[PDB]
Amino acid sequence: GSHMTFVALYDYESRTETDLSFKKGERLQIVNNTEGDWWLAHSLTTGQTGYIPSNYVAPSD
């Protein structure tokens, strides 16, 4: 009802102060997808939060 669970398809290294770095296979909760391209996400694996490139993730159980 607000859960938006995605899995990282590849690694992504942060390159701004607001990006989230993640490893392939991490599960993420999508907090805000307002921008369309870059989504605010929270890692279920690491507990870190930040923007992610939406093309690097796919919906997951």
Binding site: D37, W38, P53, N55, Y56
Partner: peptide, 8 residues
């Protein structure tokens, strides 16, 4: 804009 990165 901020383009998305290319995919590996």
């Amino acid at each position: 804009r901020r383009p998305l990165p290319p995919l590996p």
